[PDB]
Design a protein around this ligand. Structure first.
Ligand code: HEM
Length: 402
């Protein structure tokens, strides 16, 4: 009856934000309305953006939106390079996405990840033992936050003991180090070859570890060898997300002492506190991967045309004032806490339960075993990743009583 003008296209340039400060451009978009249009540094054109919790759930869970179609054109994006392997789990839709996620689902459920809690707790104590032995001045990221997620994933994946040192090295080299491309690509190839072999050997394995599950799914013609290897690599190197995120957790726990004090005073609230931290921490820069409207869809009186690219902001959704009253307040007691830090819909993060487990063990060890733990520099002096997709510290210098 009455025309509702489409929103203006908002430019969203890459900006390095300090520590855990919220993106002011995202804030502006959140205040403009539930549905906006954005233009990112890379790719071409514009894309719709939804920021409200309900809209984010709709776009990420509804069959009317697809991921596969995304690789048909250069959708405006943040990352400089795009158009990777299609077999990538992120670019697959139900006709094949389900087969891949189903293959390893059991190992990533709450009970699945509990299988490695004891071993992981032990490995963490070894890392902390070493840091304490070395003495007071340390980079918590290098000494703990970085190696721990890798050690835990090796155990969950079922990587032979004598091959884990290689996994560590490959992971570090992969998409994050010197001799860009060359070294990174080389390590990526070695890891691919490794998992290609391990999984193949597990063709008829009944093991519960991830590679065994992958090998069996392959053996049963549920997924191809290529599909299994690709996912295995992604899962193997996905721990960096925990390294970065937990990095923000401790930066927060140390810069806002009241938070650390509460967790030491009431250990029982740690699980819920971790979830609150996960909801609050601005995990990434801008937005990640869009979805293409497969047919026309209306959102808050806005007509999203079939073919249009649509982005969701999980960070904004986690600050939805209706769902999270006083959204900017870090409240460990926040009763209902339906955050989407681990995404939503078919593509929700498989590592979510694992990330919570790793975060819980980390908080325990760091807050209970480091006497007088505090930042060794001013909070604003902690270096954070620049030109990154996933936010977090480059290092987290801490000190304590020897
Ligand atoms: C606190 C740490 C983590 C956070 C905040 C996080 C967050 C996310 C988010 C927001 C997505 C996108 C969902 C979407 O496409 O709508 C995702 C996808 C994914 N994450 Fe994580 N993640 C974390 C840790 C991990 C870990 C440790 C692993 C490896 C076990 C992992 C593996 C994956 C994979 C494989 C996907 C793609 C899933 C698919 O598209 O089917 N994540 N994650």
């Amino acid at each position: 009856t009455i025309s509702q003008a489409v929103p203006p296209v908002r430019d969203w340039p890459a900006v390095d934000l300090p520590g855990s400060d919220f993106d002011p451009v995202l804030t502006e978009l959140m205040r403009e309305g539930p549905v906006t249009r954005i233009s990112l540094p890379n790719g071409e054109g514009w894309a719709w953006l939804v920021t409200r919790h309900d809209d984010v759930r709709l776009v990420t869970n509804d069959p009317r939106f697809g991921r596969e179609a995304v690789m048909d054109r250069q959708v405006t994006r943040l990352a400089p390079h795009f158009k990777p392997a299609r077999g990538a789990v992120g670019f697959l839709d139900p006709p094949d996405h389900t087969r891949l996620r189903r293959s390893v689902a059991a190992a990533f459920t709450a009970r699945g990840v509990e299988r490695v809690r004891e071993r992981s707790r032990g490995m963490l104590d070894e890392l902390v033992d070493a840091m304490l032995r070395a003495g007071p001045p340390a980079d918590l990221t290098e000494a703990v936050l970085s190696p721990f997620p890798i050690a835990v994933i090796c155990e969950l994946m079922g990587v032979p003991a004598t091959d884990r040192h290689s996994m560590h090295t490959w992971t570090q080299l992969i998409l994050s180090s010197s001799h860009g491309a060359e070294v990174s690509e080389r390590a990526k190839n070695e890891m691919n070859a490794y998992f290609s072999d391990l999984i193949g050997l597990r063709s008829d394995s009944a093991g519960e570890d991830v590679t065994s599950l992958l090998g069996a799914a392959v053996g049963r013609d549920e997924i191809t060898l290529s599909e299994a290897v690709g996912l295995a690599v992604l899962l193997q190197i996905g721990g960096e997300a925990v390294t970065n995120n937990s990095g923000q957790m401790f930066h927060l726990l140390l810069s806002r002492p009241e938070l650390a004090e509460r967790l030491r005073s009431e250990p029982e609230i740690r699980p819920r506190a971790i979830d609150e931290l996960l909801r609050w921490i601005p995990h990434r820069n801008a937005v990640g991967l869009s979805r293409i409207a497969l047919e026309d869809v209306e959102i808050k009186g806005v007509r999203i045309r079939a073919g249009d690219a649509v982005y969701v902001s999980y960070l904004a959704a986690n600050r939805d004032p209706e769902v999270f009253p006083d959204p900017d307040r870090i409240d460990f007691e926040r009763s209902p806490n339906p955050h989407v830090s681990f995404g939503f819909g078919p593509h929700y993060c498989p590592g979510g339960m694992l990330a919570r487990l790793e975060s819980e063990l980390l908080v325990d060890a760091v807050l209970d075993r480091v006497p007088g733990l505090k930042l060794a520099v001013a909070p604003e002096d902690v270096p954070f990743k620049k030109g990154a997709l996933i936010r977090g510290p480059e290092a987290l210098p801490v000190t304590w009583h020897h």
